[PDB]
Amino acid sequence: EQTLKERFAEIIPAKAEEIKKFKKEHGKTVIGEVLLEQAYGGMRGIKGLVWEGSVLDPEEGIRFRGRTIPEIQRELPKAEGSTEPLPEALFWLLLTGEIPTDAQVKALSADLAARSEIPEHVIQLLDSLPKDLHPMAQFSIAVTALESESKFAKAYAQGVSKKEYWSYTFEDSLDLLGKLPVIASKIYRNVFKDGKITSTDPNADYGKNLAQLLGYENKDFIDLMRLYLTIHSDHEGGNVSAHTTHLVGSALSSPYLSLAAGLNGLAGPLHGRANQEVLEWLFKLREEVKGDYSKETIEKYLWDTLNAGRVVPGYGHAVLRKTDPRYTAQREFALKHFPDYELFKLVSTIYEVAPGVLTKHGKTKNPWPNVDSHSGVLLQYYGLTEASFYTVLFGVARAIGVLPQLIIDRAVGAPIERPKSFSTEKYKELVKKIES
Amino acid sequence: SSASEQTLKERFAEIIPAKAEEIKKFKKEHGKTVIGEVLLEQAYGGMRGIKGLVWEGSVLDPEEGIRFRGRTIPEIQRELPKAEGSTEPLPEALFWLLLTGEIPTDAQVKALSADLAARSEIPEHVIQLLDSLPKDLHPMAQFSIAVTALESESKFAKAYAQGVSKKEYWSYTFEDSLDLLGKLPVIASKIYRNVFKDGKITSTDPNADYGKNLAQLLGYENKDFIDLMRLYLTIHSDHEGGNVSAHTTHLVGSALSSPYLSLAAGLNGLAGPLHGRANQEVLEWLFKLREEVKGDYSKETIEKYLWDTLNAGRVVPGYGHAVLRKTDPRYTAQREFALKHFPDYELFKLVSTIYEVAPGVLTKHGKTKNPWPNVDSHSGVLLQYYGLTEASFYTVLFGVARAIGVLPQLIIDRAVGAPIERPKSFSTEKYKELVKKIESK
Ligand SMILES: [Cl-]
Ligand SMILES: [Cl-]
Ligand SMILES: [Cl-]
Numbered sequence: 112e113q114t115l116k117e118r119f120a121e122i123i124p125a126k127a128e129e130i131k132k133f134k135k136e137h138g139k140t141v142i143g144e145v146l147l148e149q150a151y152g153g154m155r156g157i158k159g160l161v162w163e164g165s166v167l168d169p170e171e172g173i174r175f176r177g178r179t180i181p182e183i184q185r186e187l188p189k190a191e192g193s194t195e196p197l198p199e200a201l202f203w204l205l206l207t208g209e210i211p212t213d214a215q216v217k218a219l220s221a222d223l224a225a226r227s228e229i230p231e232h233v234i235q236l237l238d239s240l241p242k243d244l245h246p247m248a249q250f251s252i253a254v255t256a257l258e259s260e261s262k263f264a265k266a267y268a269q270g271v272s273k274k275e276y277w278s279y280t281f282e283d284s285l286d287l288l289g290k291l292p293v294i295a296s297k298i299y300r301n302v303f304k305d306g307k308i309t310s311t312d313p314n315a316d317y318g319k320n321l322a323q324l325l326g327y328e329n330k331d332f333i334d335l336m337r338l339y340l341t342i343h344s345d346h347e348g349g350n351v352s353a354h355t356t357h358l359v360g361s362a363l364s365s366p367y368l369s370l371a372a373g374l375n376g377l378a379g380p381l382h383g384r385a386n387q388e389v390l391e392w393l394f395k396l397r398e399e400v401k402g403d404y405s406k407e408t409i410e411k412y413l414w415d416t417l418n419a420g421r422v423v424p425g426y427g428h429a430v431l432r433k434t435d436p437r438y439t440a441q442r443e444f445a446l447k448h449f450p451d452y453e454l455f456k457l458v459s460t461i462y463e464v465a466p467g468v469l470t471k472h473g474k475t476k477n478p479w480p481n482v483d484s485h486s487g488v489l490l491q492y493y494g495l496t497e498a499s500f501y502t503v504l505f506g507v508a509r510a511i512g513v514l515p516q517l518i519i520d521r522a523v524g525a526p527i528e529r530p531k532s533f534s535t536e537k538y539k540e541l542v543k544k545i546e547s
Numbered sequence: 548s549s550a551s552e553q554t555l556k557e558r559f560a561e562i563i564p565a566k567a568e569e570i571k572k573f574k575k576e577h578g579k580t581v582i583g584e585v586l587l588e589q590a591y592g593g594m595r596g597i598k599g600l601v602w603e604g605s606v607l608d609p610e611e612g613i614r615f616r617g618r619t620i621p622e623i624q625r626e627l628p629k630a631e632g633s634t635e636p637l638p639e640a641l642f643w644l645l646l647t648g649e650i651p652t653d654a655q656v657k658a659l660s661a662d663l664a665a666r667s668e669i670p671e672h673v674i675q676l677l678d679s680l681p682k683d684l685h686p687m688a689q690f691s692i693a694v695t696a697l698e699s700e701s702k703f704a705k706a707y708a709q710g711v712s713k714k715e716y717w718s719y720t721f722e723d724s725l726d727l728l729g730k731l732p733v734i735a736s737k738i739y740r741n742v743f744k745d746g747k748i749t750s751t752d753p754n755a756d757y758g759k760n761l762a763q764l765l766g767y768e769n770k771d772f773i774d775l776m777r778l779y780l781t782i783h784s785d786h787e788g789g790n791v792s793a794h795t796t797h798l799v800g801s802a803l804s805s806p807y808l809s810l811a812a813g814l815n816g817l818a819g820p821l822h823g824r825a826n827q828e829v830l831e832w833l834f835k836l837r838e839e840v841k842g843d844y845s846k847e848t849i850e851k852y853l854w855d856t857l858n859a860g861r862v863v864p865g866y867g868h869a870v871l872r873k874t875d876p877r878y879t880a881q882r883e884f885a886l887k888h889f890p891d892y893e894l895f896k897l898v899s900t901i902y903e904v905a906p907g908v909l910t911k912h913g914k915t916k917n918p919w920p921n922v923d924s925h926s927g928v929l930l931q932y933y934g935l936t937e938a939s940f941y942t943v944l945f946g947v948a949r950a951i952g953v954l955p956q957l958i959i960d961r962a963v964g965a966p967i968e969r970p971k972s973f974s975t976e977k978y979k980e981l982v983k984k985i986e987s988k
């Protein structure tokens with residue numbers, strides 16, 4: 112059957128031609144207005160980016176090439192003996208819009224595992240970084256250190272034509288994706304454990320190699336990694352990690368430098384730390400109520416939080432009107448595997464009572480939980496308790512989402528990203544003219 | 548007066564609240580005004596033309612060139628403080644102007660230079676990591692690795708983790724920014740000495756200004772190359788907020804990553820060959836021309852080479868602009884430097900002959916809007932004269948300069964409370980649905 116590169120090579124010309132015709136025929140159609148408040152508001156609402164793999168449906172949650180989370184759980188292939196969707200099969204879907212067969216996904220997993228060795232200078236660099244250097248900084252350093260392997264950088268220097276760009280971007284992307292479990296696990300073992308790391312299993316799927324390289328052989332934790340990577344993979348192109356990866360890649364930096372920049376965005380505490388923010392809040396709550404998770408006690412705790420002007424982390428959305436389906440998938444994992452874990456009893460009781468309290472309080476739109484309200488409890492159950500590592504796991508997952516878009520951007524010839532700035536003095540002059 | 552002058556931090560703290568209040572009122576009273584339309588071709592065109600960013604320090608005047616806080620390049624050259632003995636504007640004086648909108652005094656600049664020099668030591672782990680990287684790992688990748696490895700020093704990251712009030716964010720971002728700026732000459736120079744020379748590096752001079760320490764750490768103690776570094780850093784410092792390195796730095800900073808992680812990401816954007824290698828692209832083209840014409844820089848031979856290039860379908864790098872309607876004043880400042888220091892250097896004679904002949908040829912060929920040169924047409928020849936010939940290092944120098952422009956905007960963003968940047972994406976199938984809806988009614 113076709114490999115991923117072969118299938119993409121077959122289908123992308125017609126999709127590129129469709130976009131070219133769409134741009135030419137409808138490019139002058141006005142699709143929105145820019146308000147002054149949007150320039151001073153982080154470009155919120157500006158329809159300015161093209162991102163093929165996922166789109167938020169305000170009524171149903173994030174969709175991956177049109178599929179909801181439960182549809183992805185049904186349709187993607189599974190490792191034998193598992194019902195979790197394989198994240199490398201999601202990588203295939205995000206890049207092509209198509210579901211791979213069992214045999215296709217098996218060959219992609221073996222290709223990723225064969226590309227997973229990291230060079231000596233990167234092993235050395237990692238082993239020497241200080242333990243107080245945050246795991247996200249270690250992760251982006253190691254990915255940037257792989258730039259000497261970039262096949263795209265070398266092809267650009269040799270003057271290849273633009274038609275060949277996506278092929279080299281694809282090779283760097285699979286090489287980089289293959290290496291992330293080894294980099295992430297080396298950081299984990301060095302900072303938090305004994306510095307000793309096992310070797311990639313050539314016949315394992317991607318989440319399974321991640322779990323085992325971190326040092327976790329429990330079969331249910333392997334299933335958690337498969338699910339965690341799939342659901343954290345992508346969430347449109349306007350979030351800071353996807354956007355930064357795309358922006359840096361638009362200047363033709365390789366996937367290594369582009370993902371490293373994206374990881375530095377994910378490292379920002381307004382983007383990548385919500386799992387740890389929820390966990391800290393839950394731990395403080397658990398201590399402060401001495402484990403009393405009665406509805407009365409939890410309800411009071413939420414009111415005392417809100418009356419103090421503090422947030423209930425991980426609840427509320429500007430747009431999505433129901434629980435995030437990525438939260439539900441993790442709730443369903445806990446109900447099947449450990450429904451009586453005490454920290455889960457707390458998370459589940461908050462889900463029962465917080466929406467109603469937040470509604471009555473009246474200041475939270477769509478007071479339902481997101482993915483980050485449920486991820487930490489699952490990691491804790493299996494002993495992965497080092498919360499300063501959790502955004503590294505998120506970064507491995509987010510590479511599954513952002514690397515396909517770099518490959519598609521190069522196949523379709525997306526140009527350098529270059530919005531326009533002005534100073535406040537000049538915006539005031541422009542506004543005065545407009546209002547005249 | 549027997550009281551000391553304000554430092555940079557004290558002056559910014561004095562003036563920023565009123566400016567923040569003016570921004571807040573502007574947004575309140577005029578936020579609903581329509582300032583532009585988004586066309587479908589802009590979402591598929593890199594957001595070109597969307598008025599979506601606020602960047603205080605510089606704005607391109609399509610009739611004059613780039614302005615820094617409203618001043619042209621010649622005005623910057625006249626009004627900024629200079630080192631004793633020199634006529635070049637000091638880049639740390641420009642850092643002051645970009646952050647405050649004000650021209651500092653000589654004494655203020657001397658004190659800022661001393662503060663940057665005091666902040667120049669890098670930690671041992673960064674020294675050892677740099678000395679262990681392979682010489683074949685590109686200088687820009689080494690540079691952003693070293694900047695990221697300083698994150699363990701971040702004062703903003705530590706304050707955020709302690710739950711400090713948002714009121715305090717700019718102050719900690721300011722400290723990290725000056726700490727980072729102070730270390731870039733040592734980082735960039737260690738890369739240069741390790742990769743290209745003998746690995747041996749001098750130490751920072753506490754009484755030297757910023758460009759002078761960069762020049763001496765690279766290995767140069769002679770006045771004219773010191774002056775080149777002062778000019779080079781000043782003119783490359785800033786160019787609006789929509790270029791990839793400025794935009795990436797702001798975008799990553801908007802998620803509250805520290806200046807170390809923000810600048811490292813911006814440096815990875817500057818490393819992209821569509822953004823940070825135009826100096827080297829011009830150099831390569833000049834060297835190919837020089838070999839082909841065997842050093843004959845007569846106007847007629849250069850005119851024929853340019854016509855032959857254009858007639859073959861090839862481009863003349865470094866000429867032509869989309870909006871700017873005359874020669875880039877940053878090019879002119881570099882030409883003035885060459886005419887003062889080495890007017891008959893051979894590679895400058897070639898650059899000068901192109902400057903004389905290319906605008907006319909490009910105009911007559913008729914496919915180049917505004918057929919005048921930009922900054923990158925002139926920077927490589929100046930570095931070559933002084934023996935800094937390793938082109939794969941040139942974007943590191945640009946990155947040192949660009950930190951002067953982007954770090955003030957991170958500090959300002961935190962002082963005014965700029966929010967996380969989050970434009971919206973759609974897939975092509977959803978854009979098609981949205982366009983059909985618009986074009987149907
Ligand atoms: Cl996200
Ligand atoms: Cl985001
Ligand atoms: Cl620029």
Ligand SMILES: [Cl-]
Binds near residue numbers: 529821
């Ligand atoms: Cl740019």
Ligand code: NA
Binds near residue numbers: 259681683
């Ligand atoms: Na090597």
